[PDB]
Design a protein around this ligand. Sequence first.
Ligand SMILES: CC(C)CCC[C@@H](C)[C@H]1CC[C@H]2[C@@H]3CC=C4C[C@@H](O)CC[C@]4(C)[C@H]3CC[C@]12C
Ligand SMILES: CC(C)CCC[C@@H](C)[C@H]1CC[C@H]2[C@@H]3CC=C4C[C@@H](O)CC[C@]4(C)[C@H]3CC[C@]12C
Ligand SMILES: CC(C)CCC[C@@H](C)[C@H]1CC[C@H]2[C@@H]3CC=C4C[C@@H](O)CC[C@]4(C)[C@H]3CC[C@]12C
Ligand SMILES: CC(C)CCC[C@@H](C)[C@H]1CC[C@H]2[C@@H]3CC=C4C[C@@H](O)CC[C@]4(C)[C@H]3CC[C@]12C
Ligand SMILES: CC(C)CCC[C@@H](C)[C@H]1CC[C@H]2[C@@H]3CC=C4C[C@@H](O)CC[C@]4(C)[C@H]3CC[C@]12C
Ligand SMILES: CC(C)CCC[C@@H](C)[C@H]1CC[C@H]2[C@@H]3CC=C4C[C@@H](O)CC[C@]4(C)[C@H]3CC[C@]12C
Ligand SMILES: CC(C)CCC[C@@H](C)[C@H]1CC[C@H]2[C@@H]3CC=C4C[C@@H](O)CC[C@]4(C)[C@H]3CC[C@]12C
Ligand SMILES: CC(C)CCC[C@@H](C)[C@H]1CC[C@H]2[C@@H]3CC=C4C[C@@H](O)CC[C@]4(C)[C@H]3CC[C@]12C
Ligand SMILES: CCCCCCCCCCCCCC
Ligand SMILES: CCCCCCCCCCCCCC
Ligand SMILES: CCCCCCCCCCCCCC
Ligand SMILES: CCCCCCCCCCCCCC
Ligand SMILES: CCCCCCCCCCCCCC
Ligand SMILES: CCCCCCCCCCCCCC
Ligand code: NA
Ligand code: NA
Ligand code: NA
Ligand code: NA
Lengths: 513, 513
Amino acid sequence: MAALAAAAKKVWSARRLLVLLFTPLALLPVVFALPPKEGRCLFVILLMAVYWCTEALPLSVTALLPIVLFPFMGILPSNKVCPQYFLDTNFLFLSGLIMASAIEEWNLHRRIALKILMLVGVQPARLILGMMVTTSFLSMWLSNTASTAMMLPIANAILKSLFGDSRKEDEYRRNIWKGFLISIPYSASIGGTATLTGTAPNLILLGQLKSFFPQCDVVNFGSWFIFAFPLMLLFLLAGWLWISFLYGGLNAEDRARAVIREEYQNLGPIKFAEQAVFILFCMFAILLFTRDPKFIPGWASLFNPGFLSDAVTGVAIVTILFFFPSQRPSLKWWFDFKAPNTETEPLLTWKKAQETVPWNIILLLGGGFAMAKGCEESGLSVWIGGQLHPLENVPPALAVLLITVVIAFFTEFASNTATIIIFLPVLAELAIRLRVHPLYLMIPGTVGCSFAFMLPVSTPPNSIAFASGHLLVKDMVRTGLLMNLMGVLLLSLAMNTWAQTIFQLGTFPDWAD
Amino acid sequence: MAALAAAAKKVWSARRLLVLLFTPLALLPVVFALPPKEGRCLFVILLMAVYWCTEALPLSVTALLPIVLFPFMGILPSNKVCPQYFLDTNFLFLSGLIMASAIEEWNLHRRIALKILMLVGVQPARLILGMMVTTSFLSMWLSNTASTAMMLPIANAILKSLFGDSRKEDEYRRNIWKGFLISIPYSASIGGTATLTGTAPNLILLGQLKSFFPQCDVVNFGSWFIFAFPLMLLFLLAGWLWISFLYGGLNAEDRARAVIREEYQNLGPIKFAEQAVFILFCMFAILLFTRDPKFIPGWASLFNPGFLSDAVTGVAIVTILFFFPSQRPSLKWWFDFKAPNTETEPLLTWKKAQETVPWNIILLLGGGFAMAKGCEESGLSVWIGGQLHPLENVPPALAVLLITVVIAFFTEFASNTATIIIFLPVLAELAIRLRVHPLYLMIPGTVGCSFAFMLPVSTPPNSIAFASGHLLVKDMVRTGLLMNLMGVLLLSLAMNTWAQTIFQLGTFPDWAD
Ligand SMILES: CC(C)CCC[C@@H](C)[C@H]1CC[C@H]2[C@@H]3CC=C4C[C@@H](O)CC[C@]4(C)[C@H]3CC[C@]12C
Ligand SMILES: CC(C)CCC[C@@H](C)[C@H]1CC[C@H]2[C@@H]3CC=C4C[C@@H](O)CC[C@]4(C)[C@H]3CC[C@]12C
Ligand SMILES: CC(C)CCC[C@@H](C)[C@H]1CC[C@H]2[C@@H]3CC=C4C[C@@H](O)CC[C@]4(C)[C@H]3CC[C@]12C
Ligand SMILES: CC(C)CCC[C@@H](C)[C@H]1CC[C@H]2[C@@H]3CC=C4C[C@@H](O)CC[C@]4(C)[C@H]3CC[C@]12C
Ligand SMILES: CC(C)CCC[C@@H](C)[C@H]1CC[C@H]2[C@@H]3CC=C4C[C@@H](O)CC[C@]4(C)[C@H]3CC[C@]12C
Ligand SMILES: CC(C)CCC[C@@H](C)[C@H]1CC[C@H]2[C@@H]3CC=C4C[C@@H](O)CC[C@]4(C)[C@H]3CC[C@]12C
Ligand SMILES: CC(C)CCC[C@@H](C)[C@H]1CC[C@H]2[C@@H]3CC=C4C[C@@H](O)CC[C@]4(C)[C@H]3CC[C@]12C
Ligand SMILES: CC(C)CCC[C@@H](C)[C@H]1CC[C@H]2[C@@H]3CC=C4C[C@@H](O)CC[C@]4(C)[C@H]3CC[C@]12C
Ligand SMILES: CCCCCCCCCCCCCC
Ligand SMILES: CCCCCCCCCCCCCC
Ligand SMILES: CCCCCCCCCCCCCC
Ligand SMILES: CCCCCCCCCCCCCC
Ligand SMILES: CCCCCCCCCCCCCC
Ligand SMILES: CCCCCCCCCCCCCC
Ligand code: NA
Ligand code: NA
Ligand code: NA
Ligand code: NA
């Protein structure tokens, strides 16, 4: 009996190397089964998928696999694979990351968070709502991991202040603890989907769209925002109601108010650098939104068509951060010859940005773009579309529901970015098989790959919440089951009601034929 | 009198913002002077050059200027500028940086350095030669900055041990101190030119070659090595002789021997991880060299022509570092059921690589590639070639000498990478005007932009050496003047004697017409 467990722990200890060395052998029959070029491309894609799901390699290292495999297997030369890793979508990602680094450098995110917490209130339903709104709003511009890791200590402090009898009171307290600790990562994942730069899978959608459908340009920052933000709000409200009912029972209040006000005071007075960063963030968001919202003529019409993009706007805005002074300039300094002549601190130095930008995620997005390019060039997409013939009779709405359910189930065990990278070409080819708009299938998959609620391994925010130690696996599972159901239903509603008007999904686009 | 100095320090305090805001106004007449597209491209290039030379912005931030300026000015759209930042040359750079990070992580560079120092000897001429050989060898694979910063403390310790009378002895000691402290950065800059991954300007040459001359493929790791390594050795020996004559006078020895042996002992026993990293480095170098050396059939002939590259080899080799165990595997562990089952440490984790890879230099190379692409597409290269008509009567050897002198003078005040980025399109167009091989002019410029010897601002290794505090500006200037002269002469000799055979420079290539 003990020997079986011994062999089990032996295999689990070396699972990385075992998976790494046995996955190519297991996937070898794929090469012989399919035509050579398509078979080798499918082998590469499946190997990358397995390595991502098992993290047999670092995710960014696995994302570098196309550069090796595509040239050796003749799918795509080096000078074609390597430039796919810096398409303009990834530079928009870099600009968003730099802006988030500037925001977090000056603690603007903490000031906004504590302000929202003060305005929302302190009642348990209201305080859950404030936590979720804050985390979702901050995850639209910062990473979900950073938003969760910054919001969790504040929630812990407020909960300690609130609770600073017997079975009833202690179980009520415990359920409140769990509700607060589970509302934050859920709301971070919710808010990450509202903006294109909020989460990596949206930018994966953009890049793989550029690869599969080069003439598709209707999805940008403004259109994605006007589609996803109302959906984000509806699902945030549904999650708040569900969590309050499950946990919140849908002098302590004074103590919590005092703690929040005290931490806001500990933030200190508002600085000139914080104001400048806030102004630049507002300019960033507004110029991204108003460049080409597809239903008001944007300022991109004033320039050469087909030249500007969201990446250019983002890079231009974040370039200001690297020379704009962080201390307020004064004209009296020029006249005051006795004043010190120390060099001014800029809003963001490049060293801080470099040490805060997640280059691993940038390389992961690049690997996804390169894999999409290889899948298109090798003809593997045509082969998948040919094999997808049994599903041509599925109604489009039912197809959306099924692919959303499948992707939401898959993302519970793998990272969102890897899941969407693997499933997006299949979604595009399935849209081709149903004669529907490719976005009508690709957008629900991109949104649903972020529906990671049931397990700590589903998404890093879930792991951060679980690290608190007072959340159980079963509690997260039973909350995330209904979270996934409500997310799938709301995604279907959004995709069948107002995504049709925003992305013009009613008719089959010409570039998709 | 004091008022003039006051105004001077006021202007110098705000030189960053003053240059940043007045350079576009100063360069505005360029747009009206030239045809619109070429004029705007020249404006962008000149603005980037000024910002690089003044570091009015961070170098990587200035390298992001094409993404903004080319689309607004209609030179190049976003989807064309942004992919130029990850051409396969930059992935070869990334693989080299990852391999250097792996080497420095396990202190293999220090072990190699101390071993070479023990073998060379301790006599002052021999010890200078050992320091220079060590630094030049380590700079072929590590950055010049890192090599200088690692070699300087060892030189300081050895010098303290050696010297642990009156005017003669103290001036002899001081000249020895200066000779050691100046031989290290010079040798680092010397060795950086020997390999393509040794210094960024070589990879700038590769990328701008890909842009200007897409069909040119004769320059790779093996050909560049066989050209530059003998030139590197000749110039290293000349510099050693010059420095020994200038400074070295071309129980203390026992004490220095003891210190070197003691530090080697302090390195500890050779580890399995160090051996594995050394084996992987040897494989990296050998497979890069033997892939296509252009005069022995390489292993790239076994695959699809035009698909493999040095980037693929580098990425494939460095991928092994991210899963190869750092502790020696044992088959007895499988049978020993009582042994601990801790997960093995790999040779390099992605976190360490990410925090040690200089992403700023990668972005700088990308900005250079994008600027070359914009210069080619805008027609600015044609305009420059048209304006270069007074120089069509210059003999090619004299042209090489003059461009090398000009570039070596310019690099004394600006960074090597920015200098070569700015001057390379001019060199290519000047090669077109003389009906000579483009490499015959482009290679000398790439080599000479690394001839930065006279000032601390010339190259970061010079700044590191000056930070010791016992090197004067005049000493560095008077050593670097003859260093530059010898470098220019040896570069002319190499380019007119054996570069012709290696790169087939005798005849005008068809792709250059
Ligand atoms: C890597 C792990 C986790 C997932 C499983 C991968 C391997 C074992 C699977 C994935 C898809 C499978 C293939 C799917 C279809 C066929 C067609 C036919 O010829 C039977 C075998 C063959 C060729 C299978 C062999 C085994 C296979 C390659
Ligand atoms: C710069 C931002 C952050 C603050 C200033 C106000 C904003 C709302 C301004 C600045 C520039 C403006 C744009 C300038 C030009 C055009 C083109 C015109 O055919 C329609 C309106 C439109 C698209 C404007 C919309 C409003 C706009 C975006
Ligand atoms: C636009 C042109 C004409 C003029 C530009 C003037 C700029 C360069 C001047 C105006 C006011 C100046 C600031 C005034 C006061 C200080 C504080 C002192 O520690 C020096 C830096 C700093 C922060 C100065 C930096 C340079 C500055 C921003
Ligand atoms: C989240 C809650 C509020 C609603 C979720 C229910 C989902 C499944 C419902 C709400 C709206 C529904 C859609 C409304 C209208 C149409 C048009 C019709 O020609 C086909 C079915 C279709 C496309 C429906 C499919 C199912 C649908 C998307
Ligand atoms: C930025 C600093 C450091 C360098 C100098 C840049 C400015 C002042 C220089 C660079 C090249 C110059 C131009 C070179 C040639 C011409 C052609 C003719 O029409 C005379 C003026 C004009 C248009 C010059 C105007 C000034 C100019 C734009
Ligand atoms: C793998 C390395 C580091 C160590 C093993 C020995 C090296 C020298 C071996 C391994 C593979 C070998 C190559 C394999 C195939 C060919 C093609 C043939 O037409 C010429 C020789 C050439 C180009 C070989 C040269 C030597 C070579 C590069
Ligand atoms: C090639 C196939 C058939 C077998 C692969 C076996 C691999 C996975 C085995 C063989 C020897 C093993 C190593 C033996 C000893 C140790 C020390 C212990 O702290 C666990 C990790 C580590 C470092 C093991 C890692 C896994 C390992 C490398
Ligand atoms: C560094 C020391 C040893 C030598 C440096 C002197 C340089 C300037 C000398 C050495 C070799 C010389 C070359 C040797 C042969 C030829 C071929 C002839 O048809 C034109 C001149 C040319 C191309 C010479 C140019 C000048 C040259 C490059
Ligand atoms: C270690 C991770 C990468 C493994 C790559 C294995 C590639 C195997 C290819 C087999 C199919 C083609 C045979 C000619
Ligand atoms: C038919 C042409 C290609 C033949 C070989 C295909 C498989 C190559 C695998 C190389 C793996 C290299 C890992 C470092
Ligand atoms: C009373 C309001 C004072 C505001 C001070 C800070 C202003 C920051 C402006 C930043 C502008 C950035 C784009 C040029
Ligand atoms: C702050 C650094 C970037 C400045 C860019 C200025 C661009 C000016 C362009 C002028 C020529 C075209 C006029 C239509
Ligand atoms: C003729 C078409 C282009 C006209 C405008 C050219 C200059 C644009 C400059 C934009 C600068 C933006 C800085 C953020
Ligand atoms: C006596 C020599 C012992 C050598 C031990 C270390 C061997 C490292 C081998 C690394 C191979 C990497 C490519 C598979
Ligand atoms: Na986010
Ligand atoms: Na997930
Ligand atoms: Na170097
Ligand atoms: Na220089």
